Design a protein around this nucleic acid. Structure first.
Ligand SMILES: [Mg+2]
Ligand SMILES: [Mg+2]
Ligand SMILES: [Mg+2]
Ligand SMILES: [Mg+2]
Ligand SMILES: [Mg+2]
Ligand SMILES: [Mg+2]
Ligand SMILES: [Mg+2]
Ligand SMILES: [Mg+2]
Ligand SMILES: [Mg+2]
Lengths: 64, 32, 228, 87, 117, 273, 96
RNA sequence: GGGAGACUGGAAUUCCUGGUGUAGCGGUGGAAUGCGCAGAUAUCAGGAGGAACACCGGUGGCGAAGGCGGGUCUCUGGGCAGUAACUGACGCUGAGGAGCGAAAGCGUGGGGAGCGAACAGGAUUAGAUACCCUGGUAGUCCACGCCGUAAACGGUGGGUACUAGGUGUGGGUUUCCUUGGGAUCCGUGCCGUAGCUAACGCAUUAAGUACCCCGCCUGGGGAGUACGGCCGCAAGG
């Protein structure tokens, strides 16, 4: 980890709000959203994550 | 810049507003 | 967030104190109880400030600031030399020079003077000049190297400053908080705690703890560098 | 914005010749269509207060294009005016 | 009276006093203590010794009812939490886990501006 | 609302209902029924309800409030007319069966739209539905005070009731007066809010307008004589000489229904302010 | 038309055997008005992260439809009025 | 997080209901009003209403300026690059005029949880109509219009040509490796050439080199006040 990015660098990925497994590695332990530097992601994919995790929390797919 | 010149105009406007508040009634009913 | 626990800190011996005749009345908050006449520092107040400083450096990295290193000891010259070149941060090893942060119009001249010499070294001019001119440069190197060790590559006027051993380097931390720039440092039971903007509980006479502290303070910049 | 097919057919209709865009008459027709399409949305969202600025900018651009067309030639100007029903 | 083998102690600590209340896993409180109830008044209610003595009194009242296993939950910031936990575990009770439960208002209600002193 | 210009003293700042959403101007002669004013006099002939006098005669315009029958039979609106007896417009429905009826014409009810009563009807303003099928937290109006007893709640203009979480054989309704009341779930309700909400702000301007509606003047008891009103006349402008009291000696108190009535359904009385 | 995705969280008291027919009864309107492809994925007995209308578990369903805004809005309204379903969410699979 | 419209959800404050539960709860540099003993505070469950959307979230994005932070959908403004096929001077400014114009205030229609002008009390002071605490009507909020004043500060008018660089960031394009780096074009920070600048300072985003246009300044008070007029329900400009 800590590379350029997993989405902006690998060139293949998809940010899906239903991907609770993938969003668990990005949400904090308590349930909050981790910072952008710790994840090392471009601004676009960071906002995509943010909105996906927000949709998950809204549909009750995460502990908020 | 300095605050002296600003507070001077502030006090001037405050005194003007106080006079206007005091004289409001002298034109309130004379206006209506 | 969090990067370490108290288990790894207990092994470093960061709960020791000094004699009871060299303390200050305003350092009785971190103490819990007197046992055999030695002072102890709480542990719950360590991880909080550690994470606070970590996030502050994480933010200042993106803002355009980094952390520095300062010191005046002449026994741990190796601990502050190996980890420095890894990230490329400033540091002082032998001689704590005067006027490096508060004065910026003077160090830039010596930086260019040293750059000129390091660039001309590639030519190898030894015969064109007299023996005295070459012999002087040998002692000049020993005179100029014991004061500046990492101030050559900063060139960025960072927005975060870290100080260590405030008891002896009070002038450093004293001038750090001058311009209001965020200041961080570790405090002792015989110094002033209000001088640092973000204190970090930690002993000043523990190399095992100082190494880990410097490592975790320098890794914050690499965290943002590898991402940028 | 305007759909690609709608813009293409509008240009083919009000174009001086095949493969013609950005001409005076074409630009005037595009602006008129844009205003006619935006008036319906404004009639609902009258409290926008932001799209009105773009509306005014487009109207000013159309007026400037019409002024230029009139300065160049009057016959073309009057023909476009009577064909689009403006003023 | 009643028996409660496992319970939980909620400690609401603020800048004025600390209230520690033991309760069954259902929610029916059994015993509780407060610095003011211990005897302290005014600013003395904020000292750590007051919270420690209140926690000790609560532990004694719980042992009177026969409670041994007691988890601990704490409210938002406030002095006396760690001292109360220490006193509870020292008075002959199982400390168990420590799950902090603090209300986190995400900009819900506008609080006062600031205390000028 | 249309404001009259200050042409005459009577039209200084007077207003009138815009009368929008009205298509026809005459009622259905097959549904209209006769009715004559009473002037506030009961069978005995004595003036019982004061301030009731000469007003323009009106029609009844029979309105069905039960809607128990014609469950699966759909119906569309035909016209929107005015009704003096009601403080809101009414709607004429052309039922698929053939008969016509009248409804309070809730707000947002345009012309041409189709409505459908019954239990399997869709929740939408204009259709009747039982409380059992109406989800909680919705807005209704004119349901009833008793199963099959007739809609008698929230019939005024721009008024409605909020249905809270129902439980068992009782559902909670928050009347427009802020009073929460329980009512069995078997009651038939009507989704949507009453129309003509723009009314109630109509400045009548002159006394003749209010008199046309059969509203006679109201004389204050202060100026009356001690033998007529408790607030004796006296010498000069007198505030009343005692506490406020009704003309029959009833003070301004609770005056509620007899204590311990059949009101076990009320869960929370309204709030004064 | 435009592509759209519809996530649905139903009541745990129901059964997967009646979940799919219930979703088809609602997609009847789409197939009779829009006539679009139908891909309905279902997975039941999934525990939620917190209480949802006095329930700890539920059944999730995902549908994809290339229909009109009015059609998707009508479907969302029908699902919100129905009681057998608890929660609904409409997303636009497009880049925007 | 460009704007308007519709739908939707979590935390948290307050109230109420069904349990548990005591004689204190709140609060200050120290205290007292007040709230409880007529079951306080506090904990479990449920219901109600009004606002805002922690964490992502910042010298990072948009807008001409105000200003724009939860999620879904309809409409829509504006910006950069490549392809340069399209007309070829249509480029820029703008007296009056028109629109937008933070917050507060005003008319009407609703609600009102927290905070809170005024107002009641408590405390200090020789004297406290304030700084501190307890309640709190307008307001803060939604719907239709006025009010046009802010440090509406970058105290920097609008468009273009030119004047060493280093260091960051966001944006979409190609060459060199084969993830790594340079150039190209726009916004946004810092250090610094010449130059400008009374100094502070600006310095490729000029306050420099020069062109086009509008407004304003020619000593401080009087006074941004007086009369008349302009619009406005009023305050007021
Ligand atoms: Mg009498
Ligand atoms: Mg008299
Ligand atoms: Mg002008
Ligand atoms: Mg306002
Ligand atoms: Mg106050
Ligand atoms: Mg001005
Ligand atoms: Mg500078
Ligand atoms: Mg005048
Ligand atoms: Mg004036």
């Amino acid at each position: 980890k800590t590379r350029k990015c997993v989405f902006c660098s690998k060139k293949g990925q998809t940010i899906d709000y239903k991907d609770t497994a993938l969003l668990r590695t990005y949400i904090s332990e308590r349930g909050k959203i981790r910072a952008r530097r710790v994840t090392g992601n471009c601004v676009q994919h960071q906002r995509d994550i943010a909105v996906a995790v927000k949709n998950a929390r809204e549909v009750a797919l995460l502990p908020f | 810049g300095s605050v002296i010149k600003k507070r001077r105009k502030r006090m001037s406007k405050k005194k003007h507003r106080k006079l206007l508040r005091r004289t409001r009634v002298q034109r309130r009913k004379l206006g209506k | 967030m969090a990067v370490v626990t108290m288990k790894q800190l207990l092994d470093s011996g960061a709960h020791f104190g000094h004699q009871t005749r060299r303390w200050n009345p305003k350092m009785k908050r971190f103490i819990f109880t007197d046992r055999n006449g030695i002072y102890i520092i709480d542990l719950q107040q360590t991880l909080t400030y550690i994470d606070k400083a970590y996030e502050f450096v994480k933010e200042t990295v993106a803002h355009g600031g980094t952390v520095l290193f300062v010191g005046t000891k002449k026994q741990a010259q190796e601990s502050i030399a190996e980890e420095a070149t890894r990230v490329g941060m400033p540091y002082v090893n032998q001689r704590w020079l005067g006027g490096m942060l508060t004065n910026f119009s003077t160090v830039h001249k010596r930086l260019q003077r040293l750059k000129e010499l390091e660039a001309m070294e590639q030519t190898g001019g030894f015969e064109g000049r007299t023996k005295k001119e070459i012999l002087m440069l040998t002692r000049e190197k020993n005179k100029l190297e014991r004061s500046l060790g990492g101030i050559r590559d900063m060139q960025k006027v960072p927005s975060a400053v870290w100080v260590v051993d405030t008891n002896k380097e009070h002038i450093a931390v004293g001038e750090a908080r001058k311009l209001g720039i965020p200041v961080i440092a570790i405090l002792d039971t015989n110094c002033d705690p209000d001088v640092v903007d973000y204190p970090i509980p930690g002993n000043d006479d523990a190399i095992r703890s100082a190494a880990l502290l410097t490592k975790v303070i320098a890794s914050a910049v690499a965290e943002g560098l590898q991402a940028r | 914005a305007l759909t690609a097919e709608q813009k293409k057919e509008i240009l083919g209709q009000y174009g001086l010749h095949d493969t013609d865009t950005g001409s005076p008459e074409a630009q005037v027709a595009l602006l008129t269509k844009r205003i006619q399409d935006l008036t319906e949305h404004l009639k609902v969202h009258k409290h926008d207060h932001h799209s009105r600025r773009g509306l005014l900018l487009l109207v000013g651009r159309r007026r400037r294009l019409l002024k230029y067309v009139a300065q160049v030639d009057v016959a073309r100007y009057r023909s476009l005016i009577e064909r689009l029903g403006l003023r | 009276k009643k028996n409660v083998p496992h319970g939980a102690a909620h400690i609401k600590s603020t800048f004025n006093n600390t209230i520690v209340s033991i309760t069954d896993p259902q929610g029916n409180v059994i015993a509780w203590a407060s610095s003011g109830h211990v005897g302290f008044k005014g600013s003395r209610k904020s000292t750590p010794f007051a919270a420690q003595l209140a926690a000790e009194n609560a532990a004694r009242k719980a042992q009177e009812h026969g409670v041994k296993k007691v988890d601990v939950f704490v409210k938002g910031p406030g002095s006396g939490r760690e001292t109360a936990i220490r006193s509870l575990q020292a008075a002959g009770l199982e400390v168990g886990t420590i799950s902090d439960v603090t209300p986190q208002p995400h900009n819900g209600c506008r609080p006062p501006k600031r205390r000028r002193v | 609302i249309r404001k009259y210009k200050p042409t005459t003293p009577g039209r200084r700042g007077a207003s009138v209902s815009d009368f929008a959403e009205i298509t026809r101007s005459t009622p259905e002669k097959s549904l209209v029924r006769p009715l004559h004013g009473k002037g506030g006099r009961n069978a005995h002939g004595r003036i019982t309800t004061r301030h009731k006098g000469g007003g323009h005669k009106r029609a009844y315009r029979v309105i069905d409030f039960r809607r128990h029958d014609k469950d699966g039979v759909n119906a569309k609106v035909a016209h929107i007319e005015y009704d003096p007896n009601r403080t809101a417009n009414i709607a004429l429905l052309h039922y698929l069966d053939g008969e016509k009826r009248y409804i309070i014409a809730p707000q947002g009810l345009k012309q041409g739209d189709v409505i459908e009563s019954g239990a399997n009807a869709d929740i939408k303003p204009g259709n009747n539905l039982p409380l059992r099928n109406i989800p909680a937290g919705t807005v209704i109006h004119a349901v009833e005070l008793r199963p099959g007893g007739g809609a008698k709640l929230a019939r005024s203009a721009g008024v409605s009731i909020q249905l809270l979480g129902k439980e068992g054989t009782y559902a909670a309704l928050r009347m427009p007066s802020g009073e929460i009341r329980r009512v069995d779930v078997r009651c038939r309700a009507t989704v949507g809010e009453v129309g003509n909400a723009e009314q109630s702000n109509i400045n009548w301007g002159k006394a003749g307008r209010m008199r046309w509606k059969g509203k006679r003047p109201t004389v204050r008891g202060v100026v009356m004589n001690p033998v007529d009103h408790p607030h004796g006349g006296g010498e000069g402008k007198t505030s009343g000489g005692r506490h406020p009291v009704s003309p029959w000696g009833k003070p301004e108190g609770r005056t509620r229904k007899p204590n311990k009535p059949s009101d076990k359904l009320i869960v929370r009385r309204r709030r004064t302010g | 038309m435009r592509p759209y995705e519809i996530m649905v969280i139903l009541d745990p008291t129901l059964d997967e055997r009646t979940v799919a027919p219930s979703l088809e009864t609602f997609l009847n309107v789409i197939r009779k008005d829009g006539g679009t492809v139908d891909k309905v994925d279902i997975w039941g007995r999934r525990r939620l992260a917190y209480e949802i209308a006095k329930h700890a578990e539920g059944i999730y369903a995902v549908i994809d439809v290339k229909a009109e805004p009015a059609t998707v809005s009508e479907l969302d309204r029908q699902l919100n009025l129905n009681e057998s379903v608890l929660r609904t969410k409409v997303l636009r699979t497009d880049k925007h």
